[model samples]
Target chain A: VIKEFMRFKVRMEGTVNGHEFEIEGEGEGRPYEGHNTVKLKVTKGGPLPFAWDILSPQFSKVYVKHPADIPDYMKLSFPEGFKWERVMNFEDGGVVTVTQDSSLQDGCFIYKVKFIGVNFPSDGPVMQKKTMGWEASTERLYPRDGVLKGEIHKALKLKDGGHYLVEFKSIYMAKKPVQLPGYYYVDSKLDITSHNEDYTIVEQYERTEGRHHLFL
Target chain B: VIKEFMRFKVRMEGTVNGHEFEIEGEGEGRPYEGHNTVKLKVTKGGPLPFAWDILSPQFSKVYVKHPADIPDYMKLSFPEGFKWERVMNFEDGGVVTVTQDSSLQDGCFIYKVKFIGVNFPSDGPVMQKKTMGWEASTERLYPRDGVLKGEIHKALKLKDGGHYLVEFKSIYMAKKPVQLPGYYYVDSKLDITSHNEDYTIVEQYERTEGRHHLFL
Candidate 1:
């Protein structure tokens, strides 16, 4: 006779658009960070039948992964017949505030956000620079083991002061399992060099013997 | 862009106790009526997450207001360590077979049948008697103008060859919201009678006299 119940606290964090203005009457003029929080009482029961038991345990934690480009200001602006309301807010890790809407009870809403100024440059000095070349110092050759010599050139530009925008345009968290307490770990290794160079020049570079390495 | 995936199904049904079994098998035979079914699926998403929405959906039709009592045969005969094996017979329903420790998955088993029994004595007669005697009549009369009557007598005596067990149970359905579902319905006018029985008897006698005079 196993009984189950669930309680959830959700947090969303992101920046707002810069075009939106803040209330300046008696307070700071810049729009503060926007946030939302909601607590849902999910389920309750016990002595669950085989069918119910086959279902999952009654619990969940969700994380809404919004784009990093959106600013916090634009989310507050709305035209006629539309409204931007603070439906919920998360001040700390656990504190939450909810706005009540009689019309929106027991329902879901979807919105979208767009990025305005972010850019990825293809041609720049950052990508053209060539560092040191790789060289083998070990005595072993083909049979045993030996290090290979190589050189790597930067292939991508690192943009400075580039602005990114995130549009809070849609909601997609309902009826889906959320990935909370998890993060994406990305790793990559790239080898970049010109192949048209003559073998004699390459051998001369090997004689100079400097290794190429880059860390991000 | 969003992609949709098919998860699994969930089933729903009321809980029941083993004591609810009204009949069981005699010796090596299966029960007079009963059925059970179990389902298995290799879900693509491994196990369901710890949330109600991640569960499969299952449905079953069940009768309401029936007494759940264990049968005499099962109570006396089933030995210790017996296990019931369940199998999916068809898409509509399933079967469960009981086997002894030695017989294992081999011996005779019981199958659940569709709900078919309607114990008229336990439901209909009890309601009729309650409605005729203590229950308020259709005639609208004040306590002083109404006359009420009721009776209970031996229906039959037990004999050696002609054995019978008659039990009566009635579930009152009330029109008021305060009354629970499948329970007693209380009429306001009847409450007044408890405080003024003499007035109620006089009112009933008057109504009976009026009926007799009209017939004459």
Candidate 2:
């Protein structure tokens, strides 16, 4: 919990289909030991701008708090328009974890994720089946404290007139940490498919290696 | 070939279950540009001790010089009783490579190898299907060059009175080069399966990460 280079908090902001959202500011320590939380703001391109607090009780992951005041239609892990942002920085780049096979884990984790829409009582759901790919570029923020910067842009032409423009400044370091002195980036694209389930679990594996900047 | 830290050659040797062998010495430049070759010796633990020269025309891999005069029973990519040693240092740790997917390759490559006893005029064949695991520990050998020292040991209880004692000093630097200024080791245990194919080509994938000594 008190490791020297461990990350305690992060602030980030980005847009999904031109809908703006920002991790408002620095996180505050929680009442519990070694816990912290921060605020996120989705400002535009939806029914209304919304804000919520994300809690961090561990260094490796952060949990999005479910707000009670939100309407049934907006009762989402993240806001309606910015839902894709939830999985963008799911795992910390700095920490290594164990895999499903009960073997030692590495920093790189591969995921085959599927996202779907949750239905409300009155309206049905919609989805897109096309596979999409994207890459992120990141930079160092704080010195040796697991802080970094990055950016990614993804465009998914959804069903109906609905569209998503994914672009954001990656002010968060937990998602991508320099486990080594060099840099880290995520280039895996999401395999999008139509579904009515609120969420979907996918299979994953890992690959580790030494690399140079010339190849990238 | 001319890079400041590129590995032009390496020397290594070890024993399978109690045999003794050594990579005789440093490599010499060949007549072709940027090409080199070195000698390998399997000193004991078989019908007879044997030695051969390995050639390297590229920075990524080396080829075993197949001897013509040997009996048909001994015509192996690597000599009998020491064949597994051939794949030990198959690739350089210092360099990154492309993979089979026509996408960008990496330093780590997974292989599911199957070795079988080739049938001779008199003697028939032998096979093993049990999966075994082993790990290698390596240390740096040269200053920034692709050279390192390592060791590994494996024991296989074979059918009949046959047995294998795997232990060796890893003096070669090619198979495990330091693409970065750190150590590299191979921990994937060979999933040993008995087969009659001269050689079996298995599937492979890549996983990359930043790790520390604590986890290792």
Candidate 3:
């Protein structure tokens, strides 16, 4: 059993659903930003036996059918909470899977997600982490189940005068029962209406994804 | 000389710029939502003679033209640093105005604002207290001045499925020796292009305003 605080300064420049996207930031003493360098602080350690699994919890794991649909695939933090139809800026979304450890601890339930079908969106990133698990908790709020589902509203791109919408579902289902804190999976939907700060697709894409701390 | 921490329990339900815009909220136990009830805490004092000028010290004020462009309008706590075009919803996007105080005595600048423009938006409870004020500080690292300005990039909303565009520019020109901090004024432009997110315009009016904490 071990617990430590870790800070990573990551900078990545890449493409998203065919559009140019980059995540880079921070110089010695600056805050991390999604466009250049974003920060991720994950707490891992609940008995080393399950310390790390495919970026999955030692006790639970997650699976995805499409690589691009992977949480934070665009490197944009997941917009957690009651947010809907937010253009995730990446098309070709997929419903992910979750799985659990069959052996349960006293008063504990585990849920596993198995993506029996990761072959639909055959164009983007390939779904490799086929199975993942998680343990839902009922400590503070309500008892959580693994019927993970959400709307990936308008995970599209409008560039070169072309409008592309990537509408899909963001669901994390566990083959078994499990409860967890944080990460109440979001759903996905798509739309192409006018927003307040109507900018060129590039402008909208910039803030829509990075401005939220509600990352999955 | 007057200084007491006073809190405001504001709630006004109605329309602005032809859209349904409301400013309401809480005291000790109400949820801080834009349409519900909101709170504003102000510190007032003097050597007052003008007690208020240019929204000055004794300083802090925020001005948004479009009703939907009011910050704290929909009451999401404002995030500081450089940010623009976040949907305070409702648009037709108008350039707005915000003036802050320009003086601080040994320890304070006195500012007071009476909403002169509120009546023009029409349809809401009277401008209500109609007047408000605040102070800016270096609560963080550096001291803050009364120069508060921001661009509601999305302040431009055109319904009727209209694709309108207002591009470029939000700058402040110093007219005097200038005794303030941050932005002392707000310049405006608006646009509504078909980028993403479809709405009946109820949302073209989200945070084109009120989303910033850098208030006057």
**Candidate 1 vs 3: which has more TM-score:** 3
Model 3 C-alpha lDDT per residue in residues B138-209, reported as the tens digit of each score: 110111232222222111112222222211222222323242232122222121211112111111111111
Model 2 residue B79 CA deviation in Å: 34
Q: Per-residue lDDT for B1-216 in model 2, tens only?
A: 112122223223333223333322222332112133332222223221211101111111222111232111111111111112122221111111111110111312111112111111122111132212221111111112233332332223333432222222333322222232223222212222222232221111111111122112
User: Could you give the DockQ of candidate 2?
Assistant: 0.01
Q: Candidate 3, residues A138-215: lDDT per residue as tens digits?
A: 000111232433332221222222222222223333333333223222111112222222111110101012111111
Off by over 4 Å in 1: A1-216, B1-35, B40-46, B51-59, B63-65, B68-181, B184-216
- Displacement of residue A35 (Cα, Å) in model 1 is 18
- Writing each residue's lDDT as its tens digit, candidate 1 over A1-216 gives 000211122111111111111110000111121112222111222111111100110101111112343211112111101111111111111111111111111222222111110011112211122212222221110100111111112112123432122111111121222222112111112122222231111111111111112231
Alpha-carbon lDDT, every model: 0.16, 0.22, 0.21
* Model 2, position B138: C-alpha lDDT score: 17
What iRMS does model 3 reach? 19.0
Highest-lDDT candidate? 2
Candidate 2 positional error at A131, Å: 33
